[PDB]
Structure formats: structure tokens, C-alpha cells
Amino acid sequence: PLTQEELLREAKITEELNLRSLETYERLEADKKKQVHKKRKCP
Amino acid sequence: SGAVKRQGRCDTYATEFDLEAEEYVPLPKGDVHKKKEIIQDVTLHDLDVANARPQGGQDILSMMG
Amino acid sequence: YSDLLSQSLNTPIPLLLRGQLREYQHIGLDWLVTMYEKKLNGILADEMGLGKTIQTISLLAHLACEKGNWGPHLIIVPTSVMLNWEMELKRWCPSFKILTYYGAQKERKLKRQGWTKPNAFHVCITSYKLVLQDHQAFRRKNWRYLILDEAQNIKNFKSQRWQSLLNFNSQRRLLLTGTPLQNSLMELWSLMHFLMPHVFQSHREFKEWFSNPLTGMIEGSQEYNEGLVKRLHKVLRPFLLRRVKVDVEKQMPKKYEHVIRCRLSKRQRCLYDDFMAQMSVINILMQLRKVCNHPNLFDPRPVTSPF
Amino acid sequence: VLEQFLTYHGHLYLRLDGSTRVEQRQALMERFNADKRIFCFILSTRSGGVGVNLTGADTVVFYDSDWNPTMDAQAQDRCHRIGQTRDVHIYRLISERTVEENILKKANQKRMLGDMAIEGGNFTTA
Numbered sequence: 251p252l253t254q255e256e257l258l259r260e261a262k263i264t265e266e267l268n269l270r271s272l273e274t275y276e277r278l279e280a281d282k283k284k285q286v287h288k289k290r291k292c293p
Numbered sequence: 294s295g296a297v298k299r300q301g302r303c304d305t306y307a308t309e310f311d312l313e314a315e316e317y318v319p320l321p322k323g324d325v326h327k328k329k330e331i332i333q334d335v336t337l338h339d340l341d342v343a344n345a346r347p348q349g350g351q352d353i354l355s356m357m358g
Numbered sequence: 359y360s361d362l363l364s365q366s367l368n369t370p371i372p373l374l375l376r377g378q379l380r381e382y383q384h385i386g387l388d389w390l391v392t393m394y395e396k397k398l399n400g401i402l403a404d405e406m407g408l409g410k411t412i413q414t415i416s417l418l419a420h421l422a423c424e425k426g427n428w429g430p431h432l433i434i435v436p437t438s439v440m441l442n443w444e445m446e447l448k449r450w451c452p453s454f455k456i457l458t459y460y461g462a463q464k465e466r467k468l469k470r471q472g473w474t475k476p477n478a479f480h481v482c483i484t485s486y487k488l489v490l491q492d493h494q495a496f497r498r499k500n501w502r503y504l505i506l507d508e509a510q511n512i513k514n515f516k517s518q519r520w521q522s523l524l525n526f527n528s529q530r531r532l533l534l535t536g537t538p539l540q541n542s543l544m545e546l547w548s549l550m551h552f553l554m555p556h557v558f559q560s561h562r563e564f565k566e567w568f569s570n571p572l573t574g575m576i577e578g579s580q581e582y583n584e585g586l587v588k589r590l591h592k593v594l595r596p597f598l599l600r601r602v603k604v605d606v607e608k609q610m611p612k613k614y615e616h617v618i619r620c621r622l623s624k625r626q627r628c629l630y631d632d633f634m635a636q637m638s639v640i641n642i643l644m645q646l647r648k649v650c651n652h653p654n655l656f657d658p659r660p661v662t663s664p665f
Numbered sequence: 666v667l668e669q670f671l672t673y674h675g676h677l678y679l680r681l682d683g684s685t686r687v688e689q690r691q692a693l694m695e696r697f698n699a700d701k702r703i704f705c706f707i708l709s710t711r712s713g714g715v716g717v718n719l720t721g722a723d724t725v726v727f728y729d730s731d732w733n734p735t736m737d738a739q740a741q742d743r744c745h746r747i748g749q750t751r752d753v754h755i756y757r758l759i760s761e762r763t764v765e766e767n768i769l770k771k772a773n774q775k776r777m778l779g780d781m782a783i784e785g786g787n788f789t790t791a
């Protein structure tokens with residue numbers, strides 16, 4: 251407590267990677283959601 | 294009266310087909326079930342001729358005409 | 359303040375950021391971080407599209423990296439944009455622990471479980487529809503930087519948000535809005551007093567004695583149209599940064615505003631004359647607006663059918 | 666009634682109101698800015714002000730302008746976005762010598778008030 255001047259600036263890497271992964275998953279979800287799903291097969 | 298008219302297909306489906314013979318009218322507003330008072334002014338001869346020469350919907354009595 | 363800031367601004371480094379700022383965004387970041395370093399609150403009045411959100415994100419990143427200002431940061435943005443600000447913070451600076459405080463009573467209760475712990479979160483994102491009634495939990499907090507997106511919701515001091523957010527304990531305050539005016543000059547006072555109370559400590563009357571003369575400059579009443587406007591500019595100079603997109607991104611096409619006016623149809627003429635020769639001025643204006651749009655708004659033509 | 670009028674003339678459109686769900690709003694935006702067939706995009710003036718991106722259109726017709734400004738601007742900015750490929754023509758309809766004339770005048774006055782107030786060179790230079 252009150253002693254993370256540098257420990258915080260070092261541990262920030264893990265949170266950065268975590269949020270990166272989370273936001274990449276968000277973008278992937280949005281991309282897959284943007285699809286059209288149209289199929290006119292002319293029976 | 295029982296008369297049902299055809300104002301046309303819904304307006305949102307205008308983009309469905311390229312060109313069609315159907316007419317497009319905006320989604321009717323207001324509640325599906327609505328009433329209203331009409332202050333009509335007619336004559337007695339109208340009722341006389343309506344009861345002497347009846348009319349109606351989907352009745353074969355129209356053959357009288 | 360203006361002179362000593364010009365002296366201070368006679369350039370920082372965008373450290374700890376994924377993307378890169380544009381030449382003008384870097385200058386805005388420099389201006390507002392120098393403002394911070396000088397212990398002054400300001401308004402980033404950059405027009406829409408210029409990307410003040412990324413500028414504020416880079417400012418927070420710089421504060422956390424260089425000044426070690428990792429403490430809790432509160433960002434109040436409209437509910438429809440909370441997701442946008444969260445995505446922006448994650449794409450540009452994922453290092454910050456982001457606390458997206460939203461949901462129902464139980465969800466928010468759960469999300470506040472253990473938030474008093476140090477370093478549990480670095481940037482808190484919420485909305486006015488939420489902080490307005492949960493101020494009891496946020497008021498008693500040591501916020502370092504208070505950020506409000508789309509500050510136009512705080513346009514007036516009679517709206518329960520200006521009051522709810524006024525006494526929020528915070529070290530620094532930042533307002534993001536593209537239109538601080540065009541409703542009245544009192545909105546500028548509502549925004550500034552929230553920003554610098556001791557500077558505008560005088561109640562709304564003081565800036566009303568600034569607007570009323572200024573408003574007459576547009577109307578028939580006394581039309582100085584000079585001197586007082588330059589004094590107002592001097593007063594607003596050290597607080598707000600304003601830039602127009604026509605020159606920052608001038609590559610945009612030109613836009614033309616055309617105004618055409620038509621006559622009123624008899625069906626419109628009769629109704630307008632009837633309402634004019636009639637309630638209250640507000641009700642009359644509303645009925646006239648309703649008439650000018652279309653007369654069917656009152657009663658469409660009656661469908662006729664036999665009796 | 667605007668749709669009732671546009672139908673009589675045969676003009677494709679995709680209305681947008683506050684009652685529409687944000688999902689439906691985004692879907693209509695994406696379908697309009699992509700499909701070239703739709704000619705009109707009827708919407709309210711003071712609807713969702715942020716997130717709107719209707720670069721697919723190239724002209725604006727303000728039917729019922731508001732007394733106060735900054736919202737017609739937010740409305741104009743829905744088509745006058747960054748990346749626009751063609752010039753935007755904004756048409757404003759006013760029914761003569763009515764309350765509408767007054768609203769237009771007041772809007773202009775407010776715009777002048779705001780222009781003379783904030784557009785006085787508040788850049789990082791000075």
C-alpha cells in the first residue's frame with residue numbers, strides 16, 4: 251500500500267494484455283455479428 | 294358496414310422487391326381498435342328508399358338490383 | 359492566468375499509448391496537459407469529429423506515466439456512449455483498469471463490491487442517468503480527474519445534474535462538448551462555474567449582466583458589438599480551447615444552406631387565422647407549429663360511408 | 666403524413682424515430698448507407714445525436730426546424746461527416762409569415778450570438 255510507484259508501472263503490462271485480448275474479442279464478436287446471413291437457393 | 298378495403302401493402306417492404314404492382318402506404322397510426330362519432334345529416338326519403346330497395350354486403354338479394 | 363500560461367507555453371511526449379495522435383490532437387494534448395500542470399481546469403471545445411476523446415485518453419495516459427497520476431479517474435458520458443468510451447480506452451490505452459459502472463441495482467451493487475480498494479480501478483466510466491441518483495456513493499470519493507463527455511447535458515443549472523455533479527470532490531475537472539452555446543450565453547456560465555467556481559463565484563446575475571448587453575448586440579437594443587465581446591473573449595481565453603473542423607480537416611467538402619419559403623394552403627390558412635384570432639402564448643405557438651407542419655395532425659379528412 | 670406524402674409520389678425510405686430501438690437504428694443506418702436504392706431517410710431532428718453516420722446521403726431537408734440551434738447542426742453533421750465525398754446541400758422549409766418565420770429568425774439570432782461569443786479565435790495560438 252502506497253508503495254507501488256514502480257510496481258504499478260510494472261504490473262500494468264498484465265492488465266494491458268488482458269484488456270487487449272478483451273477488446274480484440276469484442277471486435278471479433280462485432281465482425282461476426284455484422285454478417286448478412288442470406289441464402290436464396292431457388293428450391 | 295362490414296366493408297373491408299385494401300389500402301395497399303405495408304410501406305416498410307418497399308425495398309423488398311425492385312418493382313411491383315402493389316401500392317405502399319405508411320403503417321397506420323393510432324390504436325388498432327379506435328372509434329369515432331360522426332354527425333351525419335340525411336333525409337327521410339333516404340331511409341324510405343333504403344328500406345324499399347335494401348342493400349348489403351355478400352348477400353345475393355343484390356340480384357334485386 | 360492567460361499571460362502566465364502563454365509564458366508556460368512559450369512539448370510533451372505521448373508515452374504509453376497504442377496509437378498515435380494527429381498533429382493537431384498532439385497540440386491540444388499539449389495545451390490541456392500544460393493547463394493541468396499549471397493547476398487549472400479547462401474545456402476542450404473541439405468540434406465534433408476532431409477526436410477530443412482520444413485526446414483526453416492520451417492525457418490520462420500521460421498523467422499516469424509521467425506524473426504517476428494513476429489514481430481513480432471518473433469519466434461521465436451519456437449512456438449511449440459508455441461502450442464507445444470503454445472501447446476507445448481499451449484500444450488506445452489498455453493499461454488502465456477500467457470500471458464500467460452500469461446496470462441495475464444488484465449489478466451495480468456487485469460492481470461496487472471492493473471498489474474502495476487501491477488500484478482496483480484506474481478509470482471509472484458511468485452515465486448521467488446513473489450518477490444522478492447514485493451520487494451518495496460517488497460524492498464521498500477522492501477523484502483526481504473528473505471528465506464529462508457531451509457536457510451540453512449540463513447546459514443549465516436548473517437541470518438536476520449540474521447540482522448533482524457540482525459538489526463532486528475532485529482535484530481537476532474537464533468538460534468535453536462541441537456546442538457550449540446557441541441556447542443562451544448562460545450555458546457558458548453553467549459550464550464555467552462547474553469548472554471554476556471561485557473565478558465565477560458570483561451568482562448567475564453577474565454573467566446575466568454580461569449576456570443581456572451582449573444579446574442586445576444582435577437585436578435592435580444597444581448594439582455596441584465591440585469591446586464587451588473582446589472582454590468576454592479575454593475572460594474565456596484561458597479556460598476553453600475551441601477549434602473548427604473547416605480548417606483542421608479542411609479536406610472535407612463544402613456545404614451550402616438554402617432557405618425556401620412557401621405560401622399556406624387554404625386549409626392551413628383558415629386554421630392559422632383561427633388560432634391567431636383565438637390558452638397561452640406557448641400553447642398558441644405549439645398549435646401553430648402543429649398547423650404549419652400538416653393539418654391532419656389535428657383531424658384527418660373524415661372517411662365517408664353510408665348510414 | 667410525411668410518409669403518406671412520399672408514398673403518393675413513390676419514394677423509397679427508412680423512417681427513424683425515438684421509439685425505435687438502438688439496434689434497429691443501427692441496422693437502418695447500415696442498410697441505408699450501403700443500399701443505393703433508398704432515396705429518403707426520414708428521421709427526427711433531436712434524436713440520438715452521437716453515433717449517427719449517414720454519409721450515404723448528400724442533401725438535407727429540414728422540415729420543422731427548432732427555435733434553438735445546435736440541434737439542426739447536430740442534424741446537419743449527420744450527413745456532413747468527415748469523409749463525405751460530395752457537397753451537402755441543406756434545404757430549409759418555412760411556411761410564410763408564420764410562427765416558422767419567427768423560429769428561423771430566432772435561430773439566426775442565437776447562431777450570431779454563439780458565433781460572436783465562441784468563434785473569436787479561441788485557438789492555441791493566443
Ligand SMILES: Nc1ncnc2c1ncn2[C@@H]1O[C@H](COP(=O)(O)OP(=O)(O)O)[C@@H](O)[C@H]1O
Nearest residue numbers: 377378379380383405406407408409410411412
Ligand atoms: N488520430 C486518430 N487515429 C485514428 N482514429 C481517430 C483519430 N482521431 C479520431 N479518430 C476516430 O474518430 C472517431 C470519433 O471519436 P470520438 O472523439 O468519440 O467522436 P467525437 O468526434 O464526436 O468526439 C473515433 O471512432 C476514432 O476512431
